[PDB]
Amino acid sequence: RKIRFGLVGCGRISKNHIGAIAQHGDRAELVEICDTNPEALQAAEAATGARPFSSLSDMLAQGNADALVLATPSGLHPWQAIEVAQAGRHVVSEKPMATRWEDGKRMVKACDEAGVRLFVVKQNRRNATLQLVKKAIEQGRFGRIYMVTVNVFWTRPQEYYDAARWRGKWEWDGGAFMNQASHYVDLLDWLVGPVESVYAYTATLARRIEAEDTGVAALRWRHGAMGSINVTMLTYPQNLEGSITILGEKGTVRVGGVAVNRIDEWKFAEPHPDDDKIREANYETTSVYGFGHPLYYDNVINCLRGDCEPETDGREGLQSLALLTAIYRSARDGVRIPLPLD
Amino acid sequence: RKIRFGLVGCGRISKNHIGAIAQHGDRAELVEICDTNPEALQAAEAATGARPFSSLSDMLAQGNADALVLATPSGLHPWQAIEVAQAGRHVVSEKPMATRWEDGKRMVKACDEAGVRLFVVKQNRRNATLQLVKKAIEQGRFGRIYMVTVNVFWTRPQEYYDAARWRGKWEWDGGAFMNQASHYVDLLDWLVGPVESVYAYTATLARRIEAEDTGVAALRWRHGAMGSINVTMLTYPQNLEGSITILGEKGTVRVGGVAVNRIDEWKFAEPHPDDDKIREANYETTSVYGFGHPLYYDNVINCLRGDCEPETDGREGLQSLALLTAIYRSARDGVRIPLPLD
Amino acid sequence: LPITDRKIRFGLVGCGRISKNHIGAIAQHGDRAELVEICDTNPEALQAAEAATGARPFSSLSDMLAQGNADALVLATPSGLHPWQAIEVAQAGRHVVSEKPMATRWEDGKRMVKACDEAGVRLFVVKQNRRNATLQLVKKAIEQGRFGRIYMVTVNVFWTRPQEYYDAARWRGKWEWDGGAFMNQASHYVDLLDWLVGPVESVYAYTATLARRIEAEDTGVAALRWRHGAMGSINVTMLTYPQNLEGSITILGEKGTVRVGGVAVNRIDEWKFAEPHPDDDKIREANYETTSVYGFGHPLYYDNVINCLRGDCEPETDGREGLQSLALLTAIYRSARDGVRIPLPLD
Ligand SMILES: NC(=O)C1=CN([C@@H]2O[C@H](COP(=O)(O)OP(=O)(O)OC[C@H]3O[C@@H](n4cnc5c(N)ncnc54)[C@H](O)[C@@H]3O)[C@@H](O)[C@H]2O)C=CC1
Ligand SMILES: NC(=O)C1=CN([C@@H]2O[C@H](COP(=O)(O)OP(=O)(O)OC[C@H]3O[C@@H](n4cnc5c(N)ncnc54)[C@H](O)[C@@H]3O)[C@@H](O)[C@H]2O)C=CC1
Numbered sequence A, B: 001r002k003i004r005f006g007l008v009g010c011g012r013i014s015k016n017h018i019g020a021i022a023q024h025g026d027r028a029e030l031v032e033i034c035d036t037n038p039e040a041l042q043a044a045e046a047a048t049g050a051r052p053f054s055s056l057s058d059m060l061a062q063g064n065a066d067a068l069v070l071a072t073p074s075g076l077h078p079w080q081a082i083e084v085a086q087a088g089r090h091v092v093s094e095k096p097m098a099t100r101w102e103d104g105k106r107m108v109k110a111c112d113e114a115g116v117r118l119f120v121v122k123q124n125r126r127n128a129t130l131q132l133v134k135k136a137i138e139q140g141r142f143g144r145i146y147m148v149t150v151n152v153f154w155t156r157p158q159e160y161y162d163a164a165r166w167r168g169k170w171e172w173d174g175g176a177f178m179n180q181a182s183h184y185v186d187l188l189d190w191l192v193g194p195v196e197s198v199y200a201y202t203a204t205l206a207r208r209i210e211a212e213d214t215g216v217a218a219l220r221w222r223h224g225a226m227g228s229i230n231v232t233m234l235t236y237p238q239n240l241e242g243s244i245t246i247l248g249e250k251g252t253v254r255v256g257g258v259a260v261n262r263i264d265e266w267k268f269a270e271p272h273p274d275d276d277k278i279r280e281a282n283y284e285t286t287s288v289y290g291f292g293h294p295l296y297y298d299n300v301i302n303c304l305r306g307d308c309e310p311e312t313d314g315r316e317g318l319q320s321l322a323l324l325t326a327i328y329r330s331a332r333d334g335v336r337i338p339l340p341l342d
Numbered sequence C: 001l002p003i004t005d006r007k008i009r010f011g012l013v014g015c016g017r018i019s020k021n022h023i024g025a026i027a028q029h030g031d032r033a034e035l036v037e038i039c040d041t042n043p044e045a046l047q048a049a050e051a052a053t054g055a056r057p058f059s060s061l062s063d064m065l066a067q068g069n070a071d072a073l074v075l076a077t078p079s080g081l082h083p084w085q086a087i088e089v090a091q092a093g094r095h096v097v098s099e100k101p102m103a104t105r106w107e108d109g110k111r112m113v114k115a116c117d118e119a120g121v122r123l124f125v126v127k128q129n130r131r132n133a134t135l136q137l138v139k140k141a142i143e144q145g146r147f148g149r150i151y152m153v154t155v156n157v158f159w160t161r162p163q164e165y166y167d168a169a170r171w172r173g174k175w176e177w178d179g180g181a182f183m184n185q186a187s188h189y190v191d192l193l194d195w196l197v198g199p200v201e202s203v204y205a206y207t208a209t210l211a212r213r214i215e216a217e218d219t220g221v222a223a224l225r226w227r228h229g230a231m232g233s234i235n236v237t238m239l240t241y242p243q244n245l246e247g248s249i250t251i252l253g254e255k256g257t258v259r260v261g262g263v264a265v266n267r268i269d270e271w272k273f274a275e276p277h278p279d280d281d282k283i284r285e286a287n288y289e290t291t292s293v294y295g296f297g298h299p300l301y302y303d304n305v306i307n308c309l310r311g312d313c314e315p316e317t318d319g320r321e322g323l324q325s326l327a328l329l330t331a332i333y334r335s336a337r338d339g340v341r342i343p344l345p346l347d
């Protein structure tokens, strides 16, 4: 039979979930949906005809989805995942999996303890552009890696923060790093390797929010590479750049675009057949741009059919969450913060 | 009459100075050359017909240049400049002006006290590209500046350091930040304003030298902007980039190329005449690539001729020298180092 | 200018315990060098030394420099005088051969070096073990990349110095004059860290005076990290029961393993490399050689000094060479005193 998914939180990103599932809606279906907001609740059942619950506990008491998708305010992810795990179901959390390190740790434990799956959505990893780099690195083509820089120079006006009380709060959301660039902070670990320590500066330069809208982290990996990630939601007058550059002994790559959609530099000491898949990898990522979930849910659904291991499990999500925390302790504390965290 | 320059150090950069003085042949001439190495003193003689000395002290007992140009190993610059000033002549010091903060302050006090002028060579400040950026920043066209990123991704092979013992040594050179990237570190204070603090990592990842071939500094300006400068001489397989990117409230500029020589992104809320100077700045800055000494001399000569004041006098050199020093202290000590220095 | 047309004239300052190896090393090159002068503050050691040498005696360094003509002065005094003696020697315009270590304080060692630089004189620092045949072979393999990436380095100085050693002279075991186990005895071994393996990034040290009645440490340990990433330690005590047990270095890498044991890095014990080299056959011979000049190492060091002074060479261990180990000792002594990692290079 089909995987029964239920969706908690019917908001802005909910549609890509409904979208990705329905796109597989022959190895799975969307059976229930949940939101504490009458209107958005209405709207979503109106849109899918799954059974509407106006809170998670009612949905868990009565529904029977094999797996709940958390698309609520991020700070509620860990508590929801724990309740969902207590009711004995699998968990797909949107990113970031938590706004606090200890909550992130508890979610993973709770899921371990209940013997249920915990997936964290990191769809950007399935960019064709990014996949090429990943394989490049995996096969040793860079040889020793030396310098890595990530820019996220995007835009978010006051209105965007004002559309929802939770937005920009430490407890629910985090700032530009935890929310918008968490996808890029993820590359750091996933693509180049384990990070040894970071130092960061952040501030709230212009928006009325609690968290940061701007920041920098210098980074040092365990194998010794160094680098920065540089992030603002204040760019004028719109998204300028979402990029990663990686320089090594025998390889140089830059993945440009507004979202790591365009490989601008690709140079290597020795040839490999991927040298010729560049223009069209730029092709597939740019046309899936903003719609990586379908591909995400194909690994979910394969892992649940006992076919695969999850590509992004709770522990994987902890990698990026540890880094954000490091960056946030560094900025608040004015001190280098090393990994892994206690 | 023509201004009379002496050159101290007839090594690799000597030709560009020779080049540039001859190019103001009617306002000045190279009268004296000096190198402690018989062989390149000879050839610098053959090629200019100026009068050769074999030590600076003899050139100063016997010669009469109004201005001596120090193109020796950087660690020698402060000690030569003190001797020169002591002998009542003007100092043109190649970059960087010193390798130790204290030596730099000392060379400044001696030029002050002797009544001599002290110029530090930062030719890049003359780039037509950066002059437009400077002017937009001074006219306030960016509004509040928020994020600044600078990359120096260049290539020096081991055979480049192997050419002269002085190279890559802490005493005489410093590493990739203090030698090659100082023109870029120079930009942080010159264009964007006083820096408040830095945190840096550096390392010798590949070259056989004392100092770093690779590094990153995270930075916070007094006005609140944050940024980073990322540097490496290990780029594959040759120079990739020398770039500055500045994002403010109503402005977004990026100067790309291998050497801040092509304005790549230029966007502003309100228009201004210079908007139309851009293709010109790019052609002119790129066309003088490898050769901006001519332009630097113009000001040097305009100033000795009692016209202007120095674009880059000794305290100006002190500005990047202080940042370079905070970067090195921070990288060595693993802490944020704040300015101004003791 | 080089001294090419007449034997080098050396002067010896300090006629105490090690002076006898200098006097005899110099005499072992009687054809290129001679000892013409000797200076001691102690009427009687000077007495012994003149009768012993037939050199001209002087009872203070000022006098020896005012009336003497030596081309180079050898500094064989308590370690904390070397800086100040080297600066006055240099102001009178002659070369300086300073005994190890070149000073006991970082700033004094910098000032020694600057002074010689601005006098245009040579400053050599005695580091005889560098000429050891065993350590030369290791140096050669490290220099031709035979170890690959170096990972782990350990150095042991497990030696014996009884209280009566320290009491023999008042200056011994004092911070100002001597320093402790690290700065006096194991400095030849601290020297190997940078000389052999490469630039040190930082150290953490514990030291203590566990038994001797002296000021400085008689026992300690330093943890190390190198800039290229290897780690290791240096383990030092002058309290070994009942006499010297070990003076050793072990270097471990991707394709090389080397251990130099003995009481004084005089006997290569382990030696394994991924790819063969003629030097592989030179080991037993190098052991026998280094062992055979155990205690009499100076003759070899002076070969190089004389060459350098004759214009043949650059010195193997000049002033800056000598600052490299002074800087580690300083870092090790500041780390022990303050309880924090001390990174290099020093301000
Ligand atoms: N992977 C990705 O590309 C993206 C991930 N996200 C993440 O997904 C989550 C999406 O947030 P958005 O859709 O963008 O903001 P949102 O405000 O549009 O979503 C709001 C929905 O959740 C509801 N909600 C609030 N409290 C609830 C509760 N206790 N129970 C159930 N529903 C509750 C809101 O009333 C509304 O129904 C966030 O964690 C965000 O980081 C968001 C966009 C993209
Ligand atoms: N502004 C710019 O674009 C550039 C600046 N530089 C800077 O210029 C200086 C020169 O660098 P290079 O030309 O690359 O290296 P270099 O090694 O090629 O030039 C060295 C010359 O100085 C001589 N020398 C050494 N000691 C001396 C002394 N006491 N007196 C007189 N001569 C002495 C050497 O024998 C040699 O011929 C450094 O400060 C370097 O950073 C270098 C290239 C470009």
Ligand SMILES: NC(=O)C1=CN([C@@H]2O[C@H](COP(=O)(O)OP(=O)(O)OC[C@H]3O[C@@H](n4cnc5c(N)ncnc54)[C@H](O)[C@@H]3O)[C@@H](O)[C@H]2O)C=CC1
Residues within 6 Å of the ligand: C013, C014, C015, C016, C017, C018, C019, C039, C040, C041, C042, C045, C060, C061, C075, C076, C077, C078, C079, C081, C099, C100, C101, C126, C128, C169, C184
């Ligand atoms: N390279 C090596 O293997 C060895 C190096 N050394 C070093 O060489 C120096 C030798 O110390 P030792 O001979 O063992 O101790 P020491 O006490 O035996 O010799 C000291 C001599 O210096 C004389 N002296 C003291 N003050 C003087 C002054 N102001 N001017 C001239 N002479 C003065 C003393 O009167 C005494 O005769 C020390 O730095 C020691 O670390 C010592 C033994 C071996």
Ligand SMILES: CC(=O)N[C@H]1[C@@H](OP(=O)(O)OP(=O)(O)OC[C@H]2O[C@@H](n3ccc(=O)[nH]c3=O)[C@H](O)[C@@H]2O)O[C@H](C(=O)O)[C@@H](O)[C@@H]1O
Residues within 6 Å of the ligand: A124, A154, A155, A156, A157, A160, A179, A180, A183, A237, A238, A239, A259, A290
């Ligand atoms: C994969 C990925 O990057 N996901 C992140 C990403 O998603 P998504 O791509 O959907 O953002 P979307 O581009 O729609 O712009 C959002 C608003 O910005 C405003 N916005 C946007 C762009 C711009 O140029 N100007 C602008 O005002 C405009 O108001 C837009 O409505 O932005 C999400 C977010 O910020 O909440 C993050 O939660 C995600 O993790």
Ligand SMILES: CC(=O)N[C@H]1[C@@H](OP(=O)(O)OP(=O)(O)OC[C@H]2O[C@@H](n3ccc(=O)[nH]c3=O)[C@H](O)[C@@H]2O)O[C@H](C(=O)O)[C@@H](O)[C@@H]1O
Residues within 6 Å of the ligand: B095, B124, B154, B155, B156, B157, B160, B179, B180, B183, B237, B238, B239, B290
């Ligand atoms: C304006 C400016 O950037 N000045 C700095 C700059 O000057 P200059 O303009 O001469 O650089 P130039 O590029 O010609 O090659 C230098 C060597 O690099 C090697 N080099 C260079 C590029 C490359 O791709 N590969 C390479 O090997 C090449 O073989 C060359 O021999 O480089 C100097 C330096 O590093 O010593 C710095 O001191 C200056 O501050």
Ligand SMILES: CC(=O)N[C@H]1[C@@H](OP(=O)(O)OP(=O)(O)OC[C@H]2O[C@@H](n3ccc(=O)[nH]c3=O)[C@H](O)[C@@H]2O)O[C@H](C(=O)O)[C@@H](O)[C@@H]1O
Residues within 6 Å of the ligand: C100, C128, C129, C160, C161, C162, C165, C184, C185, C188, C242, C243, C244, C295, C297
């Ligand atoms: C090359 C080298 O290691 N140099 C260092 C070395 O020199 P040198 O070879 O002369 O030492 P020497 O072996 O004679 O023992 C010295 C006394 O130790 C006592 N000693 C020695 C061995 C032992 O087992 N027991 C013992 O009591 C016994 O009293 C010895 O008389 O020891 C010098 C010192 O300590 O002042 C250091 O300054 C040198 O830098």
